[PDB]
Scaffold this active site. Sequence first.
Site, PDB file in Angstrom:
ATOM      1  N   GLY A  51       0.881  -1.210  -0.044  1.00  0.00           N
ATOM      2  CA  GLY A  51       0.138   0.006  -0.125  1.00  0.00           C
ATOM      3  C   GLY A  51       0.897   1.260  -0.015  1.00  0.00           C
ATOM      4  O   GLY A  51       0.528   2.299   0.007  1.00  0.00           O
ATOM      5  N   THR A  52       2.191   1.209  -0.239  1.00  0.00           N
ATOM      6  CA  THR A  52       3.247   2.240  -0.154  1.00  0.00           C
ATOM      7  C   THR A  52       3.414   2.968  -1.548  1.00  0.00           C
ATOM      8  O   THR A  52       3.923   4.027  -1.754  1.00  0.00           O
ATOM      9  CB  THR A  52       4.339   1.901   0.542  1.00  0.00           C
ATOM     10  OG1 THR A  52       5.213   1.013  -0.500  1.00  0.00           O
ATOM     11  CG2 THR A  52       4.458   1.234   1.996  1.00  0.00           C
ATOM     12  N   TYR A  77       8.116 -24.445  10.062  1.00  0.00           N
ATOM     13  CA  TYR A  77       7.392 -23.500  10.944  1.00  0.00           C
ATOM     14  C   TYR A  77       7.183 -24.010  12.084  1.00  0.00           C
ATOM     15  O   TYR A  77       6.575 -24.980  12.447  1.00  0.00           O
ATOM     16  CB  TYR A  77       5.834 -23.664  10.142  1.00  0.00           C
ATOM     17  CG  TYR A  77       5.047 -22.630  10.384  1.00  0.00           C
ATOM     18  CD1 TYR A  77       4.182 -22.741  11.610  1.00  0.00           C
ATOM     19  CD2 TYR A  77       4.923 -21.321   9.587  1.00  0.00           C
ATOM     20  CE1 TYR A  77       3.093 -21.887  11.722  1.00  0.00           C
ATOM     21  CE2 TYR A  77       4.181 -20.353   9.923  1.00  0.00           C
ATOM     22  CZ  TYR A  77       3.162 -20.640  10.929  1.00  0.00           C
ATOM     23  OH  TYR A  77       2.148 -19.608  11.363  1.00  0.00           O
TER      24      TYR A  77
HETATM   25  C1  FAD Z   1      -3.492 -17.250  11.022  1.00  0.00           C
HETATM   26  C2  FAD Z   1      -2.440 -16.457   9.784  1.00  0.00           C
HETATM   27  C3  FAD Z   1      -1.985 -17.153   8.640  1.00  0.00           C
HETATM   28  C4  FAD Z   1      -1.037 -16.626   7.601  1.00  0.00           C
HETATM   29  N1  FAD Z   1      -0.821 -17.599   6.924  1.00  0.00           N
HETATM   30  C5  FAD Z   1      -0.056 -17.029   5.526  1.00  0.00           C
HETATM   31  C6  FAD Z   1       0.473 -17.668   4.544  1.00  0.00           C
HETATM   32  O1  FAD Z   1       0.442 -19.036   4.989  1.00  0.00           O
HETATM   33  N2  FAD Z   1       1.184 -17.133   3.540  1.00  0.00           N
HETATM   34  C7  FAD Z   1       1.459 -15.615   3.812  1.00  0.00           C
HETATM   35  O2  FAD Z   1       2.070 -15.249   2.760  1.00  0.00           O
HETATM   36  N3  FAD Z   1       0.961 -15.272   4.810  1.00  0.00           N
HETATM   37  C8  FAD Z   1       0.282 -15.711   5.490  1.00  0.00           C
HETATM   38  N4  FAD Z   1      -0.520 -14.863   6.708  1.00  0.00           N
HETATM   39  C9  FAD Z   1      -0.233 -13.314   6.442  1.00  0.00           C
HETATM   40  C10 FAD Z   1      -1.278 -12.598   5.543  1.00  0.00           C
HETATM   41  O3  FAD Z   1      -2.598 -13.244   5.560  1.00  0.00           O
HETATM   42  C11 FAD Z   1      -0.953 -12.191   4.230  1.00  0.00           C
HETATM   43  O4  FAD Z   1      -0.034 -11.447   4.101  1.00  0.00           O
HETATM   44  C12 FAD Z   1      -2.321 -11.796   3.394  1.00  0.00           C
HETATM   45  O5  FAD Z   1      -1.715 -11.886   1.962  1.00  0.00           O
HETATM   46  C13 FAD Z   1      -2.891 -10.609   3.910  1.00  0.00           C
HETATM   47  O6  FAD Z   1      -3.772 -10.333   3.126  1.00  0.00           O
HETATM   48  P1  FAD Z   1      -5.034  -9.100   3.753  1.00  0.00           P
HETATM   49  O7  FAD Z   1      -6.016  -9.031   2.629  1.00  0.00           O
HETATM   50  O8  FAD Z   1      -5.380  -9.529   4.988  1.00  0.00           O
HETATM   51  O9  FAD Z   1      -4.025  -7.644   3.626  1.00  0.00           O
HETATM   52  P2  FAD Z   1      -4.089  -6.678   5.077  1.00  0.00           P
HETATM   53  O10 FAD Z   1      -3.740  -7.224   6.095  1.00  0.00           O
HETATM   54  O11 FAD Z   1      -5.407  -5.972   4.974  1.00  0.00           O
HETATM   55  O12 FAD Z   1      -2.952  -5.739   4.175  1.00  0.00           O
HETATM   56  C14 FAD Z   1      -1.615  -6.277   4.231  1.00  0.00           C
HETATM   57  C15 FAD Z   1      -0.794  -5.206   3.365  1.00  0.00           C
HETATM   58  O13 FAD Z   1      -1.344  -4.787   2.026  1.00  0.00           O
HETATM   59  C16 FAD Z   1      -2.032  -4.017   1.771  1.00  0.00           C
HETATM   60  N5  FAD Z   1      -3.171  -3.847   0.970  1.00  0.00           N
HETATM   61  C17 FAD Z   1      -4.297  -4.421   0.996  1.00  0.00           C
HETATM   62  N6  FAD Z   1      -5.110  -4.103  -0.006  1.00  0.00           N
HETATM   63  C18 FAD Z   1      -4.336  -3.647  -0.849  1.00  0.00           C
HETATM   64  C19 FAD Z   1      -4.918  -2.940  -1.862  1.00  0.00           C
HETATM   65  N7  FAD Z   1      -5.938  -3.502  -2.591  1.00  0.00           N
HETATM   66  N8  FAD Z   1      -3.963  -2.160  -2.673  1.00  0.00           N
HETATM   67  C20 FAD Z   1      -2.782  -2.287  -1.934  1.00  0.00           C
HETATM   68  N9  FAD Z   1      -2.489  -2.492  -1.032  1.00  0.00           N
HETATM   69  C21 FAD Z   1      -3.215  -3.103  -0.273  1.00  0.00           C
HETATM   70  C22 FAD Z   1      -2.030  -3.110   3.042  1.00  0.00           C
HETATM   71  O14 FAD Z   1      -2.048  -1.823   3.037  1.00  0.00           O
HETATM   72  C23 FAD Z   1      -1.132  -3.872   3.875  1.00  0.00           C
HETATM   73  O15 FAD Z   1       0.277  -3.160   3.768  1.00  0.00           O
HETATM   74  C24 FAD Z   1      -1.088 -15.230   7.698  1.00  0.00           C
HETATM   75  C25 FAD Z   1      -1.670 -14.478   8.850  1.00  0.00           C
HETATM   76  C26 FAD Z   1      -2.492 -14.951   9.905  1.00  0.00           C
HETATM   77  C27 FAD Z   1      -2.853 -14.439  10.933  1.00  0.00           C
HETATM   78  C1  PL3 Z   2      -0.510 -25.516  24.382  1.00  0.00           C
HETATM   79  C2  PL3 Z   2      -0.898 -26.954  23.942  1.00  0.00           C
HETATM   80  C3  PL3 Z   2      -2.067 -26.710  23.097  1.00  0.00           C
HETATM   81  C4  PL3 Z   2      -1.557 -26.450  21.562  1.00  0.00           C
HETATM   82  C5  PL3 Z   2      -1.517 -24.886  21.120  1.00  0.00           C
HETATM   83  C6  PL3 Z   2      -2.185 -24.938  19.846  1.00  0.00           C
HETATM   84  C7  PL3 Z   2      -1.450 -24.003  18.690  1.00  0.00           C
HETATM   85  C8  PL3 Z   2      -2.294 -22.734  18.071  1.00  0.00           C
HETATM   86  C9  PL3 Z   2      -1.913 -22.444  16.783  1.00  0.00           C
HETATM   87  C10 PL3 Z   2      -2.243 -21.010  16.439  1.00  0.00           C
HETATM   88  C11 PL3 Z   2      -1.692 -20.330  15.362  1.00  0.00           C
HETATM   89  C12 PL3 Z   2      -2.023 -18.833  14.897  1.00  0.00           C
HETATM   90  C13 PL3 Z   2      -1.011 -18.040  14.832  1.00  0.00           C
HETATM   91  C14 PL3 Z   2      -0.968 -17.682  13.444  1.00  0.00           C
HETATM   92  C15 PL3 Z   2       0.468 -17.097  12.955  1.00  0.00           C
HETATM   93  C16 PL3 Z   2       0.394 -15.562  12.886  1.00  0.00           C
HETATM   94  O1  PL3 Z   2       0.799 -14.801  13.879  1.00  0.00           O
END
Ligand code: FAD
Ligand code: PL3
EC number: 2.5.1.26
Lengths: 523, 523
Positions: free
Chosen positions: A276-277, A476
Amino acid sequence: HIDLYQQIKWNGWGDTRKFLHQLKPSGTIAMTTPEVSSVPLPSLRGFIKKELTVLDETPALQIENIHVDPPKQYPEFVRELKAFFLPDQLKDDKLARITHTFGKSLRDLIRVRIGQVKNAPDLIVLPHSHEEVERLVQLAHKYNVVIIPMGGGSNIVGAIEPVSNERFTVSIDMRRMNKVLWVDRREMTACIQVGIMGPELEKQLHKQGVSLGHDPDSFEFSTLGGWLATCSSGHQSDKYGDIEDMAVSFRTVTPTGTLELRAGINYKHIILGSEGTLGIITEAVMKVHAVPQAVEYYGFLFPTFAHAVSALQQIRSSEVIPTMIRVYDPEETQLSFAWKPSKGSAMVKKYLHYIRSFDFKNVCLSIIGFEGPKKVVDFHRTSVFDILSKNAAFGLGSAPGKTWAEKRYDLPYIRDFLLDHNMWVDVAETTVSYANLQTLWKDAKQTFVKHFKDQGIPAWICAHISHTYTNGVCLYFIFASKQNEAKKLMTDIIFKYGGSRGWINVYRSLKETIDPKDICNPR
Amino acid sequence: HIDLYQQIKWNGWGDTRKFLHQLKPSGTIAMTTPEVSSVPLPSLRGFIKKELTFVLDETPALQIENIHVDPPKQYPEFVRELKAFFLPDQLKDDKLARITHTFGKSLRDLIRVRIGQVKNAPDLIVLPHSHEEVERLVQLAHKYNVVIIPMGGGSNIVGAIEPVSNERFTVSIDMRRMNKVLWVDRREMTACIQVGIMGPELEKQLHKQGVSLGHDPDSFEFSTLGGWLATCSSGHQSDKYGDIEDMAVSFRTVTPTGTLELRGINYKHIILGSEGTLGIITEAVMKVHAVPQAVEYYGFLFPTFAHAVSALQQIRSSEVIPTMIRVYDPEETQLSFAWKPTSAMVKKYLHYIRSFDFKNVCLSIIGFEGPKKVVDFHRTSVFDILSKNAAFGLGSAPGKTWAEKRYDLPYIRDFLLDHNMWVDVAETTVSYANLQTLWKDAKQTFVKHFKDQGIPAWICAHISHTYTNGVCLYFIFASKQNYIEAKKLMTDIIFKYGGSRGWINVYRSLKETIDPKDICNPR
Ligand SMILES: Cc1cc2nc3c(=O)[nH]c(=O)nc-3n(C[C@H](O)[C@H](O)[C@H](O)COP(=O)(O)OP(=O)(O)OC[C@H]3O[C@@H](n4cnc5c(N)ncnc54)[C@H](O)[C@@H]3O)c2cc1C
Ligand SMILES: CCCCCCCCCCCCCCCCO
Ligand SMILES: Cc1cc2nc3c(=O)[nH]c(=O)nc-3n(C[C@H](O)[C@H](O)[C@H](O)COP(=O)(O)OP(=O)(O)OC[C@H]3O[C@@H](n4cnc5c(N)ncnc54)[C@H](O)[C@@H]3O)c2cc1C
Ligand SMILES: CCCCCCCCCCCCCCCCO
């Protein structure tokens, strides 16, 4: 109309209607979902007790008990917004502001849970179209107003969190721009409004016979624009490619104009990963594939982590590779079996039988999937199974379509439950060569356990392998303890095993050319 | 030591010791190579007679002593500083040196050098030995405001190395002494390679270490890794090994403002395809692959062009694709058989054309590389689609030789130019929908516009690359000397059938930031 920011938890993960909770009388943990009656998970309580000693209760603050400074005022800017956008497209209530402040890292969750909201946006705008985004950005540049686009807000790096508070700041929530606009089945491409959420994209594509295939573990609550702005990794990338490969073209609204894409420079790489920069992606033409005629997922067990890793290597060298593979270390394996829903058992039975001949302290689960033409799937399956035989893999069978592989989506739900009961969990992801893999894996786990065991605190750590490369893997780690350094300890040890700039000036020039006033997610 | 620029023809293509020539008084055309002298090609004279009507008129190129080149400009302070660092053998400004560093290998280039029209020569050629020497040279060029244009093989056909103006002192930096593979990492499957290396030298050196790159443009024999990188050239095994940009892991680029190193934005794409306008690539880490265990190349005949195209389509839809495929239209098929010094292939074609009119029969060459099991699976899948589309098998022959006759074609251009003829090419991407009608219409329009004038002309085509909804169609068109009348005509009909920029300001800021004085291949 309810907006997505109202349907997704403001201080946790995912659907407000989906969560773990405990059932009467005995405190059985159960999973509530919007579509299905609460499903008891009989082994999970016992698993948490074993690994980390009533559960102590640590509720988050309620929203009315959370203080947020009033928004700044910019009467003239807001006036011009009011004259163009509908009233329902502009929000500055507390809920709106909090949900456009935080991502979903543990740091975000902790902070929102205890009411520490130091830098909210002043206003949220929810545009309906590319043409409305252009107007908004025009106005933000004219008035010198900071803009931060948001998709799902699932990022864990603070990417959406306002950094400063000198200027009026707007959160541009993309999530009402959530339509697939067309599917060209001859070009096998689809034009898609990037505010669309993962499962909504796949549901709308399926209606036209196609699929995208990008599958980060955050698939359910993240958006196409988010994937593009972050270059997120997906777990079917061996088959379908990386997101940057799937992106044919897209439109980007910048402070200095809309940038359009169609031997010289390939300019899409200037915007992919820019967070988004450098402007707001609005619409993307994406490479799609026919919905696969064969989709087959299989589970396997290995006597040790070394046998699994061996198969991983041999599969990669044979050059005939699954659509998805994941290998679970013994702790994550035990967690996977401890999470056995009694409602909604055949493989739990095969696992229990297996662990009579082989120590459960060492047994690793592998999930392996294949998609494509029947002929291709059959060739790949038979090739991988033969390699699996040579590395002492034991087959647990198939189960049916994709749901062996959609249980990774439930994990963040467990984090919320932990946070509510005096616990925390975090993650570290690393690339590591096969040569250092088994040694870092072993050392990291022992080190982390002992550092907390030596202070009188329980602590648990598991790992999985999600990606394989020519000479390595993506490893991971998930690590949990009780609420009271742990990040640093894991980081130091990862570096100590080889685990994972004049360009600054090139970026500066791009950024000053594209965004002279530094309104786009200023950093 | 003989430099590459002395071993490659200064007014034609490729090895100075390899050429077609007319035996006299017999008139038989023969091919000389550095390994065997005067191998007759008994069918080629008759083919040339048939298609372009018997004495070949002779139009020799000018000898180098008869060519005028304005003297170099002088820049004593600059040259003095060069002389202090570079060895005398590294600096050249003789006529041959200047001419071979002026022109690429387009028809326009060959024509001009052949009549001695040399308007824009560089003033000096520098042949650096190392990355550190390129750094010094670029520093000195920036300090003194000296234009620098890197050169590899000079095989480009777009005027990319040709100096544009003559205000500043101009240097050609010939990269070709920087031609070593510096290391091969066989666990990572990467090699670090000095980019001045020529294609066959690269593959020979990599083969010594059990690996291969697999980038194969038709100009493979006389082009360099740095040229491929700086141009993003296409390669004809890319379906298997990927595009050059995918093969490029990282590289070093020496710019007027510093050396840019590679391991957000993926910056390599700022430099790939930049044509020497943003600095000089010196060393690259490329993705390599093990020398394949099976390499199998086959020929097939089709009764018509429509059948061949059908097979192309269904092969791609099947998702099981060959490493390399080319389809030759009936005129290029006929040329390929008339180019006969394997004798068993001619035998099968002669027999086939007893059943099918030769004026319609198309040759296809199809290759497979990889693990035996993979090659077997792909071969058997593709062969069965080929059955469904009336493909007739010619058999194999052994290794890649079916697929390296495309390397000899530019040698034919030289011979033609020496005998009152010319030949040029136009390549286009075109949908399957427009393909056959563009093919038929281009060919017919082209011949009629010359036959209407009482002038011989010949046109053929091949397909070298297939996409989801299209192909890359390559035209080769030839006539008698009396270029711009017939190229325009082709250029127009392609544009007809749908055959194949605020980013300008992004580029301008990159270029102004990286190269403030505009010394890097100014355009
Ligand atoms: C449980 C969990 C699991 C995850 N698993 C993965 C994984 O397997 N692989 C991975 O890479 N990441 C993973 N992530 C990180 C994250 O979900 C990814 O980076 C994902 O692509 C973010 O998408 P979003 O729509 O939530 O973006 P946001 O969090 O809403 O935004 C992320 C960035 O993109 C920008 N942005 C959003 N929309 C636009 C737009 N249309 N135009 C320009 N910029 C924009 C925002 O400004 C921000 O800088 C995980 C996170 C969590 C919490
Ligand atoms: C403590 C014993 C029970 C096991 C704990 C369960 C593991 C939970 C996994 C949740 C992972 C969510 C984190 C996403 C990555 C981004 O921060
Ligand atoms: C018969 C023939 C067949 C061809 N077949 C193909 C084909 O199949 N596919 C295809 O794409 N092209 C093809 N081409 C075009 C050409 O060979 C390619 O573009 C090739 O990649 C150019 O390589 P080269 O080393 O000769 O580069 P050159 O002609 O020397 O230079 C090309 C450009 O790259 C720059 N450059 C060279 N080295 C560097 C360096 N180290 N750092 C920065 N810039 C550098 C030069 O400044 C110039 O801008 C063909 C040309 C001919 C005559
Ligand atoms: C009648 C026989 C004709 C023989 C056809 C020979 C094809 C020669 C190919 C020439 C390669 C030209 C590629 C560079 C284009 C320059 O402008």
